[PDB]
Design an enzyme around this catalytic site. Structure first.
Site, PDB file in Angstrom:
ATOM      1  N   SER A  23       0.817  -1.234   0.000  1.00 28.99           N
ATOM      2  CA  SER A  23       0.000   0.000   0.000  1.00 28.99           C
ATOM      3  C   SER A  23       0.858   1.295   0.000  1.00 28.99           C
ATOM      4  CB  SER A  23      -0.966  -0.025   1.197  1.00 28.99           C
ATOM      5  OG  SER A  23      -2.085   0.837   1.039  1.00 28.99           O
ATOM      6  N   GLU A  43      -9.486  -5.252  -4.264  1.00 30.16           N
ATOM      7  CA  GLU A  43      -8.762  -4.153  -3.629  1.00 30.16           C
ATOM      8  C   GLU A  43      -9.648  -3.109  -2.959  1.00 30.16           C
ATOM      9  OE1 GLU A  43      -5.735  -3.654  -2.896  1.00 30.16           O
ATOM     10  OE2 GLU A  43      -4.552  -5.029  -4.159  1.00 30.16           O
ATOM     11  N   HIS A  95      -7.932  -5.829   0.722  1.00 28.77           N
ATOM     12  CA  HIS A  95      -6.640  -5.163   0.781  1.00 28.77           C
ATOM     13  C   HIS A  95      -5.843  -5.525   2.034  1.00 28.77           C
ATOM     14  CE1 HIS A  95      -3.800  -1.812   0.078  1.00 28.77           C
ATOM     15  NE2 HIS A  95      -3.858  -1.655   1.389  1.00 28.77           N
TER      16      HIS A  95
END
Ligand SMILES: *[C@@H]1O[C@H](CO[C@@H]2O[C@@H](C)[C@@H](O)[C@@H](O)[C@@H]2O)[C@@H](O[C@@H]2O[C@H](CO)[C@@H](O)[C@H](O)[C@H]2NC(C)=O)[C@H](O)[C@H]1NC(C)=O
Ligand SMILES: *[C@@H]1O[C@H](CO[C@@H]2O[C@@H](C)[C@@H](O)[C@@H](O)[C@@H]2O)[C@@H](O[C@@H]2O[C@H](CO)[C@@H](O)[C@H](O)[C@H]2NC(C)=O)[C@H](O)[C@H]1NC(C)=O
Ligand SMILES: *[C@@H]1O[C@H](CO)[C@@H](O)[C@H](O)[C@H]1NC(C)=O
Lengths: 533, 537
Positions: free
Chosen positions: A200, A325, A438
């Site tokens: 990330s 995601e 995620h």
């Protein structure tokens, strides 16, 4: 006394700790100071190298977490708490951690350096899920992770001023990379074989080190998981940074850049944290206040620009995304969403959801998003609308920025490997409708399923070991493929033309084409032309 | 003298001809004058009604074709010649035709009125493929078709002036429609059951009569084949009309730019009709079939607002409408301008020819808009596959000019009261002379609606004859009842109404009716909902 746990680095002596794994012991050195504590007058300043100490620094436990907001959306819920600080907060937080085989390697060993995510507003190297011990034991690499300042402490910027220049969190990361250059050899690591990986904002960080020449000579290879320096959330311009820095000042009772920063320095850390999230009117996890600034220094141009102009021959990159995601982010601001129901939303909610997931764009731009992502044979089906907003948010913030990076790096000389992570953890506490959310490939890369005190399946341990091998292969050779292994299916490089990537889960590798090419064409090619003219 | 071939209308007496059809005899009155000849001083003026005559007018053959450009792209090729004029050109062309059963119906009969297409620059009611005889024989209806002025003669406008008001071609059609209300009863037709139908520009014309109250009184139902009044080609604004009219005038030495309208038009009236036609296609820099100079003008008279606006503002309760498209609307047009196209090869274009094609087929839009189109129609996993690019350019042109206008119309009429039926015509004629890659091209459902395969001298298959009879039945059923479905036939597959939500339509080919959803819904959302918003800002 155990000699293997005593190490001397340039700054002095350390005593580490022996850790147990189901595969044998590992040496660990936790909470090693690599900068002077950035407190008092040093707040908002670049990190100063740790001045040499006498005697023996205790390196047997994790050190403090950098000051950050603590997520209180679902208190006690495993899915949120696993990302929350698990040591006390402190501005005295610039420490790094080294894991290494036991006994220490006597020949140079490849080094993996981990950079945590958390949107540039949170994160810590001490989270259980980033435990280095299983990677080190199984793949006999050296592993290093550092803490870096986040939120205002890391990225508040008054561009042009020496009192708050911006990007100091990035500079924290760089200092740790310098530290690794000078000291990793004392642990058996090879300083000429360092591989960055992050997730990330960590992935975005990695990418920014790729694009900043003083960083680029501190590491060899890069892995970017579910993040990219060119995402719409990862940078801010100079003018907007100054506005934001000034607004935080007013919110905490502060009035000339020198006078402004001096006043900010008088305020307790917790005060800055409590107003961090209120500097922008429509502020969310995808539009946070204090992120990396493009000021000509650390980043000479925008990451988009630097990527397009770059010569990336001599670079191997491993990049990838999870299957879903966007789903995770939807419960952090999108109307109609909760982890406790199916989150079936109405079209009105969908339209509102789009303005949240794609903040600060013209009505025209938002209209185009709704056009592309509406099924006009089923414009109001609640289940389809939930999936579509998940895709909107996921595609705009993660997948298409990663897709663009992969494409451009490939066309300009990098060898790129792409994956989509498709296994949902048997231990996942988020609802079934979120799929593979995620951040939930991380536990498999670090081999957490090998910890028997946790409840993963036998299949998942075998899966984790495959992934650790791919990653470690890449770190050793620049190629995830089992160096020599004929019959096992091969992972091909990703190219701008063929766009080949592999799926990672319990089944063997499957090669596919296109990282949502149709959708990413929209986000990467058309929508910028719109936002201009 | 035969009494079936003698009819008196308000203008006076007519003598017709008895036509042989495969299935039986039909009475035909061809070449009935419905207006005074728009010659000399009457060029560019509205039609004056035909003054009464003594004695008997022989309505026994098609009259002349209105002056128009003659397509010379593929000389001797049947695919193009079949649309070209088949009587001499003349400005003396305002005649209509009536077909009626033999013997003349005793109780009032449904009337089908046909308006031909041809982009407002061409066409004629006398083309073989518009022969009313088979429809009338097979379905016992009265069929009427008229000529109307086209190109400069029909649609040159100097808005505000009385000497060249504009839309006179549409007024020709309206006059013909008034004629039918006054006189169709004399042929056994019911003036309270009149169904307009047309194709392409004919379909656009039908649509404009819907949106124009003086015309709306003159008919009851409507059929729009492969065309709509909201199409990007079917209208023009006042200022742009004037610019075009003035440029044509300039190109022929009138006057020796602009000035007094009366003097300008007067000078135009002295130019030989052929001279106007020869300069007519050079008014615009890049002129094409989807961008012709002289088309209906939005001036507040015939159309009080744009057709898009009039549609949205409309109350269409009590109206039944049948609309449709062919399978490959865009292919036919590509050989008239698009780089890399010909009827004689496969027309496999490059990525660069595709980008160039988009500019031609979607003319006069911003680069931003052209970009947007390229995005939506590119397959980004196969961005340079020549076959896919050819298909995509065909879809671009077709969706923009026909399908999405027809879809917008259907949805808005259904939402606002009208009962709508919708089709996609999917059968490629066995006699078709265009290359196989064009699929089912624009205009090639017409011959099946008019039942032309029943003509033995043409070499259609027996299945195609069955198919033609099916379609004639649908159209005639719609004409009679406002519903194309077989009255009291239960086991026969049903054709459901088209509504904004379900968006149901049927496919028409040799197989039985298949019900499907969405008229290229994803593509048309782009053309109808998004792409205009982008042209504004
Ligand atoms: C699904 O839940 C969301 C979130 O609501 C919370 O979680 C639920 C499980 C329940 O405990 C609620 O009481 C909680 O407030 C629902 O969205 C909320 O709807 C209420 C309706 O009055 C509104 O006041 C809140 O602002 C909404 N919250 C958000 C984040 O939008 C949603 O309606 C639920 N879906 C259903 C019931 O189908
Ligand atoms: C496909 O045909 C077009 C049209 O060209 C004409 O028709 C052909 C069937 C053949 O008879 C040609 O000799 C004709 O000129 C081709 O496009 C043309 O190419 C020529 C020369 O390359 C050029 O001068 C013209 O401007 C082109 N015309 C258009 C409308 O683009 C096309 O290249 C052919 N494709 C092939 C052969 O693969
Ligand atoms: C154009 O000229 C004629 C001829 O004399 C004249 O009668 C007329 O008034 C003029 N038109 C206008 C609009 O002035």
């Amino acid at each position: 006394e155990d000699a293997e746990l005593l190490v001397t680095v340039r700054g002095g002596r350390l005593r580490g700790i022996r850790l147990k794994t189901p595969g044998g012991p590992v040496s660990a050195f936790l909470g090693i100071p690599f900068a002077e504590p950035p407190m008092g007058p040093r707040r908002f300043l670049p990190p100063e190298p740790k001045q040499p100490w006498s005697g023996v620094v205790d390196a047997t436990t994790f050190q403090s977490v950098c000051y950050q907001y603590v997520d209180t959306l679902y208190p006690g819920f495993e899915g949120t708490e696993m990302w929350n600080p698990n040591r006390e907060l402190s501005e005295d937080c610039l420490y790094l951690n080294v894991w290494t085989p036991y006994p220490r390697p006597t020949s140079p060993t490849p080094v993996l350096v981990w950079i945590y995510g958390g949107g540039f507003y949170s994160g810590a190297s001490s989270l259980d899920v980033y435990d280095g011990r299983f990677l080190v034991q199984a793949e006999r690499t050296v592993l290093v992770s550092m803490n870096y300042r986040v939120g205002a402490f890391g990225f508040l910027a008054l561009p042009g001023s020496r009192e708050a220049p911006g990007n100091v969190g990035l500079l924290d990361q760089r200092l740790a990379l310098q530290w690794v250059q000078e000291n990793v050899a004392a642990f058996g690591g090879d300083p000429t074989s360092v591989t960055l990986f992050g997730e990330s904002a960590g992935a975005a960080s990695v990418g920014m080190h790729l694009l900043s020449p003083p960083s680029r000579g501190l590491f060899h290879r890069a892995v970017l998981q579910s993040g990219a320096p060119n995402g719409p959330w990862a940078t801010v311009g100079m003018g907007e940074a100054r506005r934001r820095a000034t607004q935080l000042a007013h919110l905490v009772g502060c009035p000339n850049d020198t006078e402004l920063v001096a006043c900010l320095r008088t305020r307790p850390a917790q005060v800055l944290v409590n107003h961090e999230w209120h500097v922008l009117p429509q502020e969310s996890v995808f539009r946070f206040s204090f992120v990396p600034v493009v000021d000509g220094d650390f980043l000479s141009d925008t990451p988009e620009a630097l990527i397009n102009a770059g010569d990336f021959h001599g670079l191997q990159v491993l990049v990838g995304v999870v299957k879903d995601e966007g789903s995770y982010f939807l419960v952090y601001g999108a109307p109609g969403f909760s982890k406790d129901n199916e989150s079936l939303i109405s079209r009105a909610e969908f339209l509102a959801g789009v303005r949240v997931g794609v903040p600060q764009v013209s009505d025209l731009a938002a209209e185009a998003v709704v056009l592309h992502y509406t099924d006009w044979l089923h414009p109001e089906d609640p289940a389809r609308l939930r999936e579509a907003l998940s895709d909107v948010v996921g595609d705009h913030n993660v997948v298409c920025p990663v897709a663009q990076l992969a494409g451009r790096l490939a066309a300009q000389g990098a060898r790129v490997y792409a994956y989509v992570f498709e296994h949902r953890a048997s231990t996942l506490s988020w609802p079934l409708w979120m799929g593979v959310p995620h951040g939930y490939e991380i536990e498999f890369i670090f081999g957490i399923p090998l910890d028997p005190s946790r409840n993963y399946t036998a299949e998942e341990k075998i899966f984790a070991q495959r992934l650790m091998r791919y990653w470690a292969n890449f770190a050793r050779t620049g190629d995830p493929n089992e160096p020599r292994d004929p019959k096992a299916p091969q992972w091909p490089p990703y190219t701008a033309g063929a766009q080949q990537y592999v799926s990672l889960d319990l089944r063997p590798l499957e090669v596919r084409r296109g990282l949502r090419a149709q959708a990413c064409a929209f986000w990467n090619r058309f929508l910028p032309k719109l936002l201009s003219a």
